[model samples]
Target: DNWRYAHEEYEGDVQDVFAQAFKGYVEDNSDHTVQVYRFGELDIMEQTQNGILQFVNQSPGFTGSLIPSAQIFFIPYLMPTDMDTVLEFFDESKAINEMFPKLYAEHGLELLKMYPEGEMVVTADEPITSPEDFDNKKIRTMTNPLLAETYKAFGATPTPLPWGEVYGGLQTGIIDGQENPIFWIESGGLYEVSPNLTFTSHGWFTTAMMANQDFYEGLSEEDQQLVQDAADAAYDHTIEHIKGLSEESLEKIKAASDEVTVTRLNDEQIQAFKERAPQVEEKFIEMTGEQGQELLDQFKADLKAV
Candidate 1:
């Protein structure tokens, strides 16, 4: 798995944990077969076509497959700062557990597991420490409007681009910067070209593992339970894996590239970003309607306990 090199430590990589659980499911349940598709094997649209893919992993950017309210997770500074609080929200938040399932079902999928890759970090040609640093810069964003608004709120010109073209866009100076989890920057070698990483802590690069409802519902109850158990195992193990990696990934990235610079914002700097977050939140509600507001209200309530 690529996660083996995402960090210095490989034993607890989330990919390995999920692999073992999925492997165990196939071994223990011989009646069913499991296949894993790496990136590029099947694009998100192709993977979710009717019954072409029974199960797959997806980011919030896979817009057609998720409800508009799901974009709330991608809104900068909306999620809690630390991994524990974020994990708590994922595990205990009614909005995620109850509301999301219904919303997902409408789109022909079941949300099995939700987890973070790591906290989001901005990679730029030069160090960016505050909102003013983003001036006139062309930052690549997923083709999501809310995400583009996030960059706009931070004072950058957002250019929507597919993941496949980001490295070259950065390499040729076609784009000035982009954001992703720290480990992703390492894995993709984005740090080689855009060596300045700013710890924005604006959001976590969250992803979901989902299954086609038709295929999932057709399964025997026992097999359904097994699939859920395996997903839960992966979720729990990944929570711990990301917590540790988030702490050390910066150093790992710096070590891999001598030119890399890591900039972590202070409270004042992070606060400035937080102040501008309401714009993106409003945009989310406008796009998703009342449902988005309800989810945001529920998240705030759940966060108090977390």
Candidate 2:
């Protein structure tokens, strides 16, 4: 079997971890040949996924939330301050994978891997010392309904916007702020516009790696193992690379923007954010129905036990 793998991030990012693991899989298993493509752009994952679904019955590519782009909403003020709790929740488990099929089945896709991609840092044009500071301010967020509701519950107007438009959005005051892994903000040049950086520690965001269901299932057993193995390897490599890069990106942001200020919320301040969490969580469940409630319960249990 021969497969094509693609992603939107630069070759440098994917080549760091994903490429090596994928190459290793192909090298060790001759049942399939793997081809990798880097388009040097974003949002191509959806397009690439559709293309794969059309041609090859079985091909490997990043799609949907599997890219862990959702991690942006998982950080600073979204996640606990303790890193241990976060890592424990993401530890290799088939539980997350088990739920993927159901999740993707809704979209005619399958989840291959859902793991930590990185952390998100808050950047605002003004100081965000507490929940009060967020009121009425526009925070550029993804189009996730849960996230939008979460932000709204915190008193800020949740503005669903694209990252490409973020810089211009900030420059023209279309939006007041944005949040992302430090590396993303720096790499995507969001820091140039929203210079005030804050450590919200809400979530250690992750990307989801998925494939079309029919395509993934059509692979031969040997090829299936190879793809799964590659995904596991890539997940590990990406986790470490993202964690390291998050720290590095912070330093980079400082160097790139003289006015960038990072605010570390105190325990009391963080609790304020937490105070509104239940409302957001309840709203998520109400909006997402039982499926959302189940995932939320599992996530909460994972965090609590950790």
Q: Name the candidate that leads on lDDT.
A: 1
lDDT of 2 at 104: 58
Shift in Å, residue 48, candidate 2:
5.9
Off by over 4 Å in 2: 14-20, 31-79, 82-84, 92-95
Per-residue alpha-carbon lDDT of candidate 1 for residues 144-210, written as tens digits (9 for 90 to 100): 7788888999999999888888999999999999998877787678899899989888988877677
Question: To one decimal, what is the Cα RMSD in angstroms of model 2 from the true structure?
Answer: 4.4
Q: Write the per-residue lDDT of candidate 2 for residues 1-306, one digit (tens) a residue.
A: 656665434455533356556656666767566666554322444554575521111111123134222222332354445544566666733236565457555665556666555655788888788889999899887656567766787778888775457789999998999776677777777788888887766765455556666687777787678677877777677666665577787788788778777788777887887787777656645655766656656655655666
Best by TM-score: 1
TM-score of each: 0.90, 0.83
